[PDB]
Each structure stands twice: as C-alpha cells, then as structure tokens.
Enzyme design. Structure first.
Site, PDB file in Angstrom:
ATOM      1  N   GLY A  46      35.179  29.572  48.539  1.00  0.00           N
ATOM      2  CA  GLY A  46      35.664  30.764  47.900  1.00  0.00           C
ATOM      3  C   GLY A  46      34.633  31.059  46.833  1.00  0.00           C
ATOM      4  N   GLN A  51      32.089  35.089  39.099  1.00  0.00           N
ATOM      5  CA  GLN A  51      31.316  33.867  39.117  1.00  0.00           C
ATOM      6  C   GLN A  51      29.833  34.105  39.194  1.00  0.00           C
ATOM      7  OE1 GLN A  51      34.082  31.618  42.055  1.00  0.00           O
ATOM      8  NE2 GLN A  51      33.232  30.094  40.669  1.00  0.00           N
ATOM      9  N   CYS A  89      35.892  24.123  41.214  1.00  0.00           N
ATOM     10  CA  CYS A  89      35.385  25.390  40.735  1.00  0.00           C
ATOM     11  C   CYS A  89      33.885  25.180  40.703  1.00  0.00           C
ATOM     12  CB  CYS A  89      35.988  25.795  39.380  1.00  0.00           C
ATOM     13  SG  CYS A  89      36.193  27.488  39.131  1.00  0.00           S
ATOM     14  N   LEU A  90      33.170  26.081  41.366  1.00  0.00           N
ATOM     15  CA  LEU A  90      31.735  26.040  41.365  1.00  0.00           C
ATOM     16  C   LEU A  90      31.241  26.311  39.949  1.00  0.00           C
ATOM     17  CD1 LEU A  90      31.209  28.023  44.643  1.00  0.00           C
ATOM     18  CD2 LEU A  90      30.944  25.497  44.252  1.00  0.00           C
ATOM     19  N   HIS A 131      43.481  31.270  43.661  1.00  0.00           N
ATOM     20  CA  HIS A 131      42.411  30.735  42.821  1.00  0.00           C
ATOM     21  C   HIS A 131      41.350  31.824  42.550  1.00  0.00           C
ATOM     22  CE1 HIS A 131      39.543  27.526  41.461  1.00  0.00           C
ATOM     23  NE2 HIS A 131      38.676  28.415  41.906  1.00  0.00           N
ATOM     24  N   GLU A 132      40.912  32.541  43.566  1.00  0.00           N
ATOM     25  CA  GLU A 132      39.903  33.540  43.343  1.00  0.00           C
ATOM     26  C   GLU A 132      40.479  34.719  42.624  1.00  0.00           C
ATOM     27  OE1 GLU A 132      36.970  32.554  43.707  1.00  0.00           O
ATOM     28  OE2 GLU A 132      37.557  30.894  45.114  1.00  0.00           O
ATOM     29  N   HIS A 135      40.172  34.307  39.007  1.00  0.00           N
ATOM     30  CA  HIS A 135      38.883  34.778  38.469  1.00  0.00           C
ATOM     31  C   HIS A 135      38.841  36.244  38.115  1.00  0.00           C
ATOM     32  CE1 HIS A 135      36.493  31.233  38.626  1.00  0.00           C
ATOM     33  NE2 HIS A 135      36.756  31.048  39.900  1.00  0.00           N
TER      34      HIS A 135
HETATM   35  O1  LIG Z   1      34.419  28.433  42.721  1.00  0.00           O
HETATM   36  C1  LIG Z   1      35.289  28.483  43.599  1.00  0.00           C
HETATM   37  N1  LIG Z   1      36.256  29.421  43.603  1.00  0.00           N
HETATM   38  O2  LIG Z   1      36.306  30.341  42.578  1.00  0.00           O
HETATM   39  N2  LIG Z   1      35.260  27.432  44.378  1.00  0.00           N
HETATM   40  C2  LIG Z   1      36.328  26.631  44.930  1.00  0.00           C
HETATM   41  C3  LIG Z   1      37.420  27.330  45.764  1.00  0.00           C
HETATM   42  C4  LIG Z   1      38.633  26.433  45.927  1.00  0.00           C
HETATM   43  C5  LIG Z   1      39.869  26.931  45.530  1.00  0.00           C
HETATM   44  C6  LIG Z   1      41.000  26.139  45.685  1.00  0.00           C
HETATM   45  C7  LIG Z   1      40.911  24.854  46.245  1.00  0.00           C
HETATM   46  C8  LIG Z   1      39.681  24.336  46.642  1.00  0.00           C
HETATM   47  C9  LIG Z   1      38.546  25.125  46.478  1.00  0.00           C
HETATM   48  C10 LIG Z   1      35.484  25.570  45.627  1.00  0.00           C
HETATM   49  O3  LIG Z   1      35.148  24.338  45.093  1.00  0.00           O
HETATM   50  O4  LIG Z   1      35.030  25.972  46.680  1.00  0.00           O
END
Ligand SMILES: O=C(NO)N[C@@H](Cc1ccccc1)C(=O)O
Length: 157
Positions: A46, A51, A89-90, A131-132, A135
């Site tokens: 996601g 982001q 979260c990235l 989750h997104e 954001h």
């Molecule tokens: O940065 C993002 N999303 O904003 N990344 C998440 C998305 C996500 C959401 C919920 C559970 C697992 C993963 C990720 O590590 O890929």
C-alpha cells in the site's frame, strides 16, 4: 520514476489531503505509475500519496488484494466488528504493531481513468485500505495502538 518516501516526523504526513480533480489526465496517470513503482521498490502492499509528499486523495495498493489505484476515497464500516492484526509503515521503517481495524468495509472512489469504483472488503484487503485512508486524513498507526507490548522492530518480534 521512483520517488522518495518521507518519514514520520515530517509535517506533510499530518495534513488532510484535497481531492484529485484531474482523473483521466496524463499527469495523474504518470503519478500513479510512479506510485506503483515506488511501492514495489520499497516492498509495500500500500502507498498513499502523502507518503511521497504529494498532497492528494490518492492511494495504491495490492499483493490476495487486487492491484488497485484509488482516488477521492470514502470508507464506510459495515459492522461494528474490529479485528487485530499486524501493521507497518514505509514511513516508519523497521517497526510493526498490532492495530484494531474494522473487519468489513465498503470503499468508494475513482480509478485514475475516471471510472467509478465501489467494493466491499474484509480482513487484510479491508485493513490495507483503512490504513492508507488514514494517511489521507493525517493519521498514522501509532496513534491507534491499544497494546504497546506489541509495538517493536520486525526482526526482534
Ligand atoms: O506505508 C504503507 N502504507 O501506508 N505500507 C504498509 C501497508 C500495510 C497496511 C496494513 C498492514 C500491512 C501493511 C506496508 O508495510 O506495506
């Protein structure tokens, strides 16, 4: 074009994003392409536009979860049932926590070409979307942690 993902602490992840008004355009198609690529290079499921420091109601996601690009999203829970599950979260690399989300949702919006999108989702699909969406409204997962024992580094837990 891979974009720089911004990290927690930056005020740009705290804004509430304006709507996309250029559905069907080449500029938007270019941005979406970038978003899928950036999401892939970082190994996410996601990625929301804030982001990568773009102030827009836009997210991409997909792994089963359909590869989707979604603009001007709205979400409606379909029951009061919450479920716990792991997230990361990235923008918070290395960490993970358990987070309660709605089990069943509907989401609505537009594909990049202008096509209406409306789906019911459950479990993991539903979580990635919630989750997104967060954001888009300036909200990150730490603020929804209930049990802080579960908050930690991925390699440790
Ligand atoms: O940065 C993002 N999303 O904003 N990344 C998440 C998305 C996500 C959401 C919920 C559970 C697992 C993963 C990720 O590590 O890929």
């Amino acid at each position: 074009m891979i974009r720089d993902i911004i990290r927690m602490g930056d005020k740009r992840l705290l804004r509430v994003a304006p709507q996309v008004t250029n559905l069907g355009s080449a500029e938007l198609h270019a941005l979406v392409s970038d978003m899928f690529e950036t999401m892939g290079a970082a190994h996410g499921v996601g990625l929301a536009a804030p982001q990568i420091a773009v102030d827009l109601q836009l997210m991409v996601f997909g792994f089963a979860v359909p590869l989707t690009a979604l603009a001007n999203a709205q979400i409606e829970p379909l029951s009061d049932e919450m479920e716990n599950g792991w997230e990361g979260c990235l923008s918070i690399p290395g960490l993970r926590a358990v987070i309660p989300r709605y089990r069943y949702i509907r989401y609505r919006g537009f594909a990049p070409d202008g096509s209406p999108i409306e789906r019911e989702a459950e479990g993991f699909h539903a979580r990635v979307v919630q989750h997104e969406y967060d954001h888009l409204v300036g909200r990150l997962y730490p603020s929804r942690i209930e049990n802080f024992d579960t908050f930690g580094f991925d390699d440790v837990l």
